[PDB]
Write a protein that binds this ligand. Structure first.
Ligand SMILES: Cc1cc(-c2c(Cl)cccc2OCCCC(F)(F)F)nc(N)n1
Length: 221
C-alpha cells in the first residue's frame, strides 16, 4: 500500500575525495562564484560528448536534439539548479565518477593548494564539480543517459553519498545539478548575480545558456 517504494544505496567516498570535500565546504574563500563556471564547464563537456556521438549515430538524439544549458534559481527552495541536455550518466558512472574512485587529481589538487595554488584552479585537476560545496550544503545530481533509467545522486559531504532511481519528472536526456545553498550564499539566486558571473566567466561556452527564474505561485507550492 505504499505510494512508492525504492531501494536507496549508500556509498562511502574514497578518502581523498572526502578530504577534498571537507576542505572545500569548511574553508573560507573569497572567490566562491567560480563554482558556476565549473558546473557550466562540465555541462559543456557533456554536451560535446553527446554531439560527438550523434555524428556517427543520429539516433542518439532521439531523446532530444537541442543541446543547451539551463540555470534555474528557486528562492522558495533556496536552490540553484544547472541543467543540461548532455550525455548523462549511467548508474555505474555516478557511483564511479562521483565518489568511490579517486583520480590522481583529487590528491594533486590538495597538494597544489598546499603549494600555494588558488581554489579557482580546481578545474585543471578534473574535480571542479566539488567546488559546488563552496556555496552548497547539499548537492543532488539527477541524470539520464540514453537507454538507461533516471538516477539521483546526493551528498551533504558527510563522507558518504546516496544513489537511487529518480521517479520525479522524467528528463529526456542529460544531467541536473541541484545546489541546496548554504544560508549565507543566497546571492547566487539573484538574477543580477547569476548574469554577471556567467558574463565574466563563461563567455566562451558554445551552447545556449538560459535563465529560468522559478517561483511557486501562492497556495500552489
Ligand atoms: C555527464 C555529466 C557529468 C557531470 C559530472 C558530475 Cl555531475 C560530477 C563530476 C564530474 C562530472 O563530469 C565530468 C565530465 C563528464 C563528461 F566528460 F562526460 F562531460 N556533469 C554533467 N553536467 N554531465
Amino acid at each position: 500500500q505504499p505510494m512508492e517504494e525504492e531501494e536507496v544505496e549508500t556509498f562511502a567516498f574514497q578518502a581523498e575525495i572526502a578530504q577534498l570535500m571537507s576542505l572545500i565546504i569548511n574553508t573560507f574563500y573569497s572567490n566562491k562564484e567560480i563554482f558556476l563556471r565549473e558546473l557550466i564547464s562540465n555541462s559543456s563537456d557533456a554536451l560535446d560528448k553527446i554531439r560527438y556521438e550523434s555524428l556517427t549515430d543520429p539516433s542518439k538524439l532521439d531523446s532530444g536534439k537541442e543541446l543547451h544549458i539551463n540555470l534555474i534559481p528557486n528562492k522558495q527552495d533556496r536552490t540553484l539548479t544547472i541543467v543540461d541536455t548532455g550525455i548523462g550518466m549511467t548508474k555505474a558512472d555516478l557511483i564511479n565518477n562521483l565518489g568511490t574512485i579517486a583520480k590522481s587529481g583529487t590528491k594533486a589538487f590538495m597538494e597544489a593548494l598546499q603549494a600555494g595554488a588558488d581554489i579557482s584552479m580546481i578545474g585543471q585537476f578534473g574535480v571542479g564539480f566539488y567546488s559546488a560545496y563552496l556555496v552548497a550544503e547539499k548537492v543532488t545530481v539527477i541524470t539520464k543517459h540514453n537507454d538507461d533509467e533516471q538516477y539521483a545522486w546526493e551528498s551533504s559531504a558527510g563522507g558518504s553519498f546516496t544513489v537511487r532511481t529518480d521517479t520525479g519528472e522524467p528528463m529526456g536526456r542529460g544531467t541536473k545539478v541541484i545546489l541546496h545553498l548554504k544560508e549565507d550564499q543566497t546571492e547566487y539566486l539573484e538574477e543580477r548575480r547569476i548574469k554577471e558571473i556567467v558574463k565574466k566567466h563563461s563567455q566562451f561556452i558554445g551552447y545556449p545558456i538560459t535563465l529560468f527564474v522559478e517561483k511557486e505561485l501562492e497556495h500552489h507550492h
